[PDB]
Amino acid sequence: SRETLHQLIENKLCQAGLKREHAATVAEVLVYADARGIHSHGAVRVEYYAERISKGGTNREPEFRLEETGPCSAILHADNAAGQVAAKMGMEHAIKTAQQNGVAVVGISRMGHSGAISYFVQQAARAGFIGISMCQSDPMVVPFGGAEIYYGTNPLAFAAPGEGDEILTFDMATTVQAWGKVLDARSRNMSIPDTWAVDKNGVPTTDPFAVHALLPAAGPKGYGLMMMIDVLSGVLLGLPFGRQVSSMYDDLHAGRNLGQLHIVINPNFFSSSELFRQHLSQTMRELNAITPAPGFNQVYYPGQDQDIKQRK
Amino acid sequence: MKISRETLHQLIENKLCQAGLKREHAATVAEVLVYADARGIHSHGAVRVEYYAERISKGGTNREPEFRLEETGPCSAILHADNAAGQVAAKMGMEHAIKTAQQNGVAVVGISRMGHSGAISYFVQQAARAGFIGISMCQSDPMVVPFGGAEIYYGTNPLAFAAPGEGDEILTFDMATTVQAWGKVLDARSRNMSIPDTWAVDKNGVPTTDPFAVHALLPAAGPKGYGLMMMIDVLSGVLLGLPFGRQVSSMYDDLHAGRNLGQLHIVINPNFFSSSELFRQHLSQTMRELNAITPAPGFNQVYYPGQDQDIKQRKAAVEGIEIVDDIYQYLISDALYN
Ligand SMILES: NC(=O)C1=CN([C@@H]2O[C@H](COP(=O)(O)OP(=O)(O)OC[C@H]3O[C@@H](n4cnc5c(N)ncnc54)[C@H](O)[C@@H]3O)[C@@H](O)[C@H]2O)C=CC1
Numbered sequence: 296s297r298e299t300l301h302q303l304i305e306n307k308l309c310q311a312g313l314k315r316e317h318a319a320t321v322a323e324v325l326v327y328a329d330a331r332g333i334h335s336h337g338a339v340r341v342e343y344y345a346e347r348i349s350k351g352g353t354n355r356e357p358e359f360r361l362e363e364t365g366p367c368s369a370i371l372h373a374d375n376a377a378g379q380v381a382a383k384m385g386m387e388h389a390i391k392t393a394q395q396n397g398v399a400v401v402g403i404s405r406m407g408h409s410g411a412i413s414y415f416v417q418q419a420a421r422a423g424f425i426g427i428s429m430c431q432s433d434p435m436v437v438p439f440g441g442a443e444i445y446y447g448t449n450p451l452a453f454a455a456p457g458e459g460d461e462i463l464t465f466d467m468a469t470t471v472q473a474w475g476k477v478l479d480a481r482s483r484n485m486s487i488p489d490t491w492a493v494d495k496n497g498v499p500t501t502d503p504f505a506v507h508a509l510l511p512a513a514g515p516k517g518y519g520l521m522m523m524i525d526v527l528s529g530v531l532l533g534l535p536f537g538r539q540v541s542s543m544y545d546d547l548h549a550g551r552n553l554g555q556l557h558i559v560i561n562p563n564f565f566s567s568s569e570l571f572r573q574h575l576s577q578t579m580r581e582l583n584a585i586t587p588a589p590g591f592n593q594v595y596y597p598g599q600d601q602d603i604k605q606r607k
Numbered sequence: 608m609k610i611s612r613e614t615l616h617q618l619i620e621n622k623l624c625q626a627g628l629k630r631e632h633a634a635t636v637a638e639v640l641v642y643a644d645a646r647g648i649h650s651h652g653a654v655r656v657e658y659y660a661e662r663i664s665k666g667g668t669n670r671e672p673e674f675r676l677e678e679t680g681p682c683s684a685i686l687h688a689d690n691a692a693g694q695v696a697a698k699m700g701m702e703h704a705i706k707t708a709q710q711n712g713v714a715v716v717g718i719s720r721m722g723h724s725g726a727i728s729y730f731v732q733q734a735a736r737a738g739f740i741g742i743s744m745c746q747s748d749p750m751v752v753p754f755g756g757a758e759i760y761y762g763t764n765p766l767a768f769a770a771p772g773e774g775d776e777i778l779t780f781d782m783a784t785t786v787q788a789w790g791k792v793l794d795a796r797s798r799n800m801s802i803p804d805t806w807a808v809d810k811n812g813v814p815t816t817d818p819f820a821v822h823a824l825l826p827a828a829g830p831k832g833y834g835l836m837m838m839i840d841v842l843s844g845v846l847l848g849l850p851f852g853r854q855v856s857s858m859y860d861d862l863h864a865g866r867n868l869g870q871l872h873i874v875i876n877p878n879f880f881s882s883s884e885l886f887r888q889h890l891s892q893t894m895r896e897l898n899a900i901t902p903a904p905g906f907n908q909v910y911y912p913g914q915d916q917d918i919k920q921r922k923a924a925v926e927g928i929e930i931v932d933d934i935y936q937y938l939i940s941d942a943l944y945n
């Protein structure tokens with residue numbers, strides 16, 4: 296069960312170094328990923344996290360400092376704490392701030408990997424607000440037209456509340472595919488589609504063992520989106536940016552120094568929250584009623600495929 | 608033909624003024640249009656004036672809007688635009704966003720009930736010129752199938768971003784959420800070429816190479832563009848209590864009726880997070896480093912995002928802006944439309 300795995304991972308990470316409360320938080324986010332089929336960011340990471348913690352490449356005793364910079368802005372100085380802990384804490388502050396003052400823009404400064412980041416925007420939506428989040432990731436992607444890596448798979452996530460317990464959740468890597476698909480096609484020795492990745496010369500490739508770098512989604516569009524995310528979650532916070540961003544296997548003894556940015560918007564500072572939620576539910580219904588194209592059994596609203604996998 | 612920036616501005620300004628816009632409003636509309644043309648975004652340039660003139664004439668764009676700025680919090684506002692010209696409403700709202708982020712760090716400003724606002728990167732460039740990060744997005748005419756779908760719901764719903772580098776350097780990025788903007792289907796309609804099958808679908812949701820058989824556009828990157836246009840509809844439409852999704856008006860529904868569109872600006876003042884000087888240095892460093900990346904076979908250069916358009920804008924300052932001669936002919940003429 297869910298509370299089973301939480302207890303497992305909570306225990307394992309608590310003994311590898313983390314305060315019990317920190318272990319409980321990382322556990323939760325990891326399960327969340329596997330359940331929604333986001334396996335690249337689920338348990339395939341758990342022994343690894345345990346290692347980095349034991350070796351100090353993730354801070355077991357971070358000195359957190361939430362620095363408020365304005366009525367609707369803050370930086371959580373996270374001291375290279377586990378990303379799941381840091382990002383969750385900053386989102387709690389963003390939610391509190393948007394609750395009172397309407398909007399919140401909160402940077403997470405110096406954290407480890409934070410995982411399937413839709414977890415954090417769901418926090419905002421469960422509180423009745425719109426959540427947007429994005430973060431830097433290991434340099435892994437060619438600029439459009441390029442043969443050298445610069446940005447990472449730099450994800451973007453969004454959630455908004457509908458009626459009752461309904462939430463619409465959207466989450467995407469800015470590459471054609473997440474990296475975890477390249478490794479999957481490496482392990483099963485499959486070939487990969489030629490739209491996913493390039494070789495050491497920047498030429499598209501079908502051999503996942505000849506992959507030097509991922510391609511950006513929609514060419515120049517994914518390129519701009521990952522740039523935007525690097526500027527918003529990295530440059531804005533004065534952190535390393537672009538190619539300077541650390542990679543997971545550079546040094547298990549050193550903090551990652553990653554950044555993440557949350558933006559939270561309280562609907563009642565703009566219009567009726569009741570009608571907002573009614574209209575989100577209406578969006579979800581209407582999209583579901585759309586005539587599917589040949590080949591599709593249904594049209595899903597964004598994220599519904601994951602919402603479904605979750606409950607099964 | 609190529610033409611100056613000041614002259615095109617004047618032509619557009621006069622033509623919209625005689626349609627019935629206040630000269631102040633017609634000026635603002637004109638500079639956003641010339642901005643688009645200079646950057647090569649011609650589908651949102653002077654080509655739209657004749658349409659605008661008709662809508663203004665027939666009352667579908669408010670020539671006497673009662674603007675009302677409703678401040679809802681320290682960093683939030685709605686500009687009620689009373690179906691004023693979008694370029695006017697969006698710029699006014701961005702001026703408020705800039706002022707708000709200057710004093711309070713961040714601003715989220717809705718433009719509620721406006722006409723078409725054009726190449727929306729104009730508005731984020733305002734923020735970047737003021738030293739801030741600008742993000743903007745707006746609803747558009749239903750024209751796009753959901754991923755997996757065969758009926759239209761969302762529009763080409765654009766997203767734009769700009770941030771300042773050192774000096775007058777700005778990094779500007781601006782995209783429709785479809786594989787291609789609608790103008791590419793219109794352009795290949797004008798010259799009778801088959802389009803690739805990744806752009807659009809027929810009435811049945813089957814991808815098509817026949818531009819006259821196109822019923823709807825496809826979202827960029829499948830479900831990703833789908834999610835992005837939904838996000839933009841939610842942020843610039845649902846959030847403002849406006850018509851959303853398939854309810855959004857289309858350009859030729861009713862020329863006598865206000866469009867009721869929505870747009871959302873988000874402005875972030877880097878000074879509220881870290882040194883704005885080092886921020887600008889790092890944006891300029893980003894642009895340099897991306898330019899120095901080894902190009903892949905086929906390419907002669909790696910561009911930083913938006914650099915292709917910056918180059919066009921730079922060239923247009925030298926040689927002048929290229930527009931279709933037919934548009935020049937209409938702008939000098941005494942005809943408002945037809
Ligand atoms: N350093 C980090 O933390 C990173 C984390 N990630 C995460 O990994 C995950 C990667 O996601 P991707 O492979 O790009 O996702 P994807 O391509 O499978 O799907 C993207 C989005 O579209 C939705 N979607 C997909 N198919 C759909 C359909 N048929 N109908 C309606 N909606 C549909 C998904 O639910 C999801 O919200 C994300 O959770 C992302 O946050 C990714 C990169 C880096």
Ligand SMILES: NC(=O)C1=CN([C@@H]2O[C@H](COP(=O)(O)OP(=O)(O)OC[C@H]3O[C@@H](n4cnc5c(N)ncnc54)[C@H](O)[C@@H]3O)[C@@H](O)[C@H]2O)C=CC1
Binds near residue numbers: 440515726788916
């Ligand atoms: N209702 C409205 O007002 C709407 C307005 N629009 C506008 O129409 C325009 C749509 O543009 P798209 O067709 O998506 O543009 P696009 O596909 O040509 O390019 C998108 C972005 O990527 C950049 N880019 C493209 N190729 C590049 C390269 N090789 N290197 C570096 N950067 C590159 C562009 O400069 C641009 O910033 C936008 O200005 C948008 O604001 C679009 C839809 C609706």
